Amino acid sequence: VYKFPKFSKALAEDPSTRRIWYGIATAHDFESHDAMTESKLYQKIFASHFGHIAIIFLWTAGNLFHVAWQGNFEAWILNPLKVRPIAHAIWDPHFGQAAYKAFLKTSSPANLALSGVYEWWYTIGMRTNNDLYQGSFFLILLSSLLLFAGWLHLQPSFRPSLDWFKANEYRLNHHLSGLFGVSSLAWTGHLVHVAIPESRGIHVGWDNFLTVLPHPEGLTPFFSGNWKAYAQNPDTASHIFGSGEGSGTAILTFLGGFHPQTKSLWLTDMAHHHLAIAVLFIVAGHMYRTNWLIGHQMKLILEAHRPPGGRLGIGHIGLYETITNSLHFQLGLALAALGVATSLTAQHMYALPPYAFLASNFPTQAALYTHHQYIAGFLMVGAFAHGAIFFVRDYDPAVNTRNGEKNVLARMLEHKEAIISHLSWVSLFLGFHTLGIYVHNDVVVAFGQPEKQILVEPLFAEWIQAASGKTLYNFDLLLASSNSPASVASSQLWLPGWLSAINDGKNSLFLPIGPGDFLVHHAIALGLHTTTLILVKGALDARGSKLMPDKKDFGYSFPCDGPGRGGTCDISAWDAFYLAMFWMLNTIGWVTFYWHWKHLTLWQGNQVQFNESSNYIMGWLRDYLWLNSSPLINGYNPFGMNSLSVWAWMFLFGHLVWATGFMFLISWRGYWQELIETIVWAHERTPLANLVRWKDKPVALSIVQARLVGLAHFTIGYVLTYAAFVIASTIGKLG
Amino acid sequence: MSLDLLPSFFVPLVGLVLPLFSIIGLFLYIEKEN
């Protein structure tokens, strides 16, 4: 009953099971630990970062090793459009003979790989199960390096100080230039040297790379300035990927669009992209000042940025010390940027597939988009939660105020009511009218008169599609016109490739849109606005409100303030995160439902099914869920089973976890404490069991813990059931 | 010993033995005193 929460003496003195539960959930909140200083905080965070990167590299190495050992990578190379990639083998003693037979792939039961790693590794120039093994070996070596570094930087003479940790200019210069630019430069080097010849049949391994010229002229044009030579003779339109037939000699080109065979971006396009990004980031990494008297001091930049007329208060004067001294502000900024970035990855890796033969891998396309959108929602909610935490525990009004006037951040708490009221107005506006149009379509179609539907053509979005060259909406605007200056400017660089790809019905590049797209985009906007409303309200109201003008004195996460003053359930800022998690899950569900139904109709060919039935709710319920759930639920029946049996089991498992979350959310404490007391009496008053007694007094889960557990069940069930549905439906419908 | 015997050697090992020893260690640690 002691010594487990070593970091908290208050918990270690708890005589109940709450100590164990809270010991887990407070282990990473280093700022709240006993005998805590800032130096130890930054050092522990640094070591934890090292361990985390080691974990990531070990996970990647495991994926590589299991593809190399139990996969069919080599067979998939020779026939990427017919051979289904294998993730890893299965050894489960609970299998019957039927399950073994159904999951049997080649030599052993195995799982199909939906991560798209086969296409990614094939694109970057891997052709052998020994190339994957080398990658796994190297990644385990890198993990060992990172673990050694993490141990080393906790040693006495190697523990960095607060000044080093808060040295913003040095870290920015190095991160930008070194990390981004130099990693892009090295990736361009690999892309060219290995990937470009490997796509043309020439093997460039760790033996013949110092003697195989990536370009026939060989670094002469680069130093000579004749950089056009690297773009001459690109890959033809009859080039077979991985073979020298119809190949070229160029290494950096503009082509635009996709490879005619793999239906993916040109490797020479991506090498040029990464070279340009490398140059730009290396240049941008010299901005801030270091030991050589030139550069920028960001404190001065922030302080000097006050509009002269005066509408942002005193400007950004106090922001430097605010961000530097707070790890939650930086964490929130990083999480918001990462969420936007992974939303970008999801939205671009389906419209512009970058890996060979990934466009025809429909289950992996759906899985990748869903995975990245869910990660995006999680990251955004985390960014807002950490902003709220910064408000609660790191924000100092004195730093952000100069002689009564407030800086740009402190002024966000002055018109907080205006911000929240207008977020509420936008949410109500969008919800009222999107639901009104959807229900109008529902009722009108149900009454057998679909012509009375309200169908709004998304002209604004179709205008953008025409601006990028789509000649489908008869707009003749910028790139849909051959005479506009936008078209004449790039008529010789990348329009022929771009136009040939955007004006193609088999791509996902700028999918044609209609009224259903309009309505679902408005639903998405409503979801985004409502999630933002909850999170922003929790962040701004974190320090106090009218119901609790001292909420900052109770911390970020506390159960309530009691039944007084009318009742104060879910009044903390943590509860705002807890409520906004449901709205994030709902919004990501809407986004992924829209994407998956649109792409299922596109792949099956019945795009008229979406364009007609997507305007009313029953259309969704009947033609997406009810229609495509048939292959999934018949993964096992009283007659047999298929390789989709695991997905049906996961479907039911997700439903069960969802409803257990419903348990933990609807039923609150107090009802579970008295029942536990009855159980305690029963155990204490029964023979043959009195010999065994608990060391920690069994008590009901706390209010905040119960909310967390219900949210965890809700989210896990949500994710599992939707993953099972999307994967099984795609597999069982599209062969 | 072939490579295909490794799943049958490791999956029971990990998925049953590692839980047992991990539970023993974690229970002992969280039930300690001072």
């Binding site: 010594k3 070593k6 522990k44 070591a47 934890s48 090292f50 361990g51 080691a54 070990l58 090793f65 190399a68 050992w69 199960n129 020994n130 093994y133 796994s136 070996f137 385990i140 070596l141 993990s143 060992s144 673990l147 050694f148 993490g150 141990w151 906790l154 | 010993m1 072939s2 490579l3 490794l6």
Partner: peptide, 30 residues
């Protein structure tokens, strides 16, 4: 198909990475 030697040495290297992990874990304290 990878050999027994390839898998064996990868397992041995994985063990070394495990001993480095507990050293980091124990250094991050109880």
């Amino acid at each position: 198909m990878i050999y027994d030697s390839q898998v064996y040495i990868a397992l041995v290297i994985a063990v070394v990475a495990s001993v480095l992990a507990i050293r980091l874990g124990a250094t991050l304290y109880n």
